[PDB]
């Protein structure tokens, strides 16, 4: 009883945002709370931010 | 009264990362100016990242071209890291035409003398067979910060914009035993750019930005 089917494949690209759950390999979870600016992050003696 | 710091040395270690010196500096002003300039540099430095890319036989970035070892997405990712300097025009359109086996690098772009490619060895893609060719148009514009393609024909592929020549900034405050006076600070700022900005020009722009923001109440 169906005449024809049209299947459309969209390809969305989800980058990252607060609320996206991230975890390690040892049962440690967490939802991103802020996409901090690069200049606001902690940096070591060499200036490389974490 | 206060001694005014000034640019005394630009110690070019390599093509990318340089090390400028500010001297003399009073007690505490070294860290203040170092952190302020670090934040300004990492925040707001004009850059010339790619914005749009158009390959002839490509409709969307999730496809492939015959004879190209890389997916279109990986080509766009490689272009996203392309370091380029434009002088006269805020917006330019470079062209890349290559045919034959081998690594299609950034050196195969049309010269366009008003545009400088700082890393000619920057590989863009690989061609696998003689009869395979890539003919593509790249759109390079001036900008500031990070402008994801989502915020801003069906053949145009948008690449995320990364208008930020700086990559790493580190300031060290040392002792400057100069002018027959002790406990004067020297601010050595080591900055690792992508090669598209002059370190002296970068410091000048950062200081100008800070002064303009500070003019609101002085």
UniProtKB/Swiss-Prot annotation, chain A:
It comes from the Bacteria. Belongs to the RNA polymerase beta chain family. DNA-dependent RNA polymerase catalyzes the transcription of DNA into RNA using the four ribonucleoside triphosphates as substrates. The RNAP catalytic core consists of 2 alpha, 1 beta, 1 beta' and 1 omega subunit. When a sigma factor is associated with the core the holoenzyme is formed, which can initiate transcription. This is DNA-directed RNA polymerase subunit beta. It comes from Escherichia coli O157:H7. The gene is rpoB. The chain holds residues 1045 to 1094 of 1342 of the full protein.
Curated annotation (Swiss-Prot), chain B:
Residues 1-218 are annotated as: Alpha N-terminal domain (alpha-NTD). The keyword Nucleotidyltransferase applies. Keywords: DNA-directed RNA polymerase, Nucleotidyltransferase, Transcription, Transferase. GO terms for cellular component: cytoplasm; DNA-directed RNA polymerase complex. GO terms for molecular function: DNA binding; DNA-directed RNA polymerase activity; protein dimerization activity. The keyword Ligase does not apply. One of its GO terms (biological process) is DNA-templated transcription. Its EC number is 2.7.7.6. It is an enzyme of class 2 (transferase). It comes from the Bacteria. It catalyses: RNA(n) + a ribonucleoside 5'-triphosphate = RNA(n+1) + diphosphate. The N-terminal domain is essential for RNAP assembly and basal transcription, whereas the C-terminal domain is involved in interaction with transcriptional regulators and with upstream promoter elements. DNA-dependent RNA polymerase catalyzes the transcription of DNA into RNA using the four ribonucleoside triphosphates as substrates. Homodimer. The RNAP catalytic core consists of 2 alpha, 1 beta, 1 beta' and 1 omega subunit. When a sigma factor is associated with the core the holoenzyme is formed, which can initiate transcription. Belongs to the RNA polymerase alpha chain family. This is DNA-directed RNA polymerase subunit alpha. The chain holds residues 7 to 232 of 329 of the full protein.
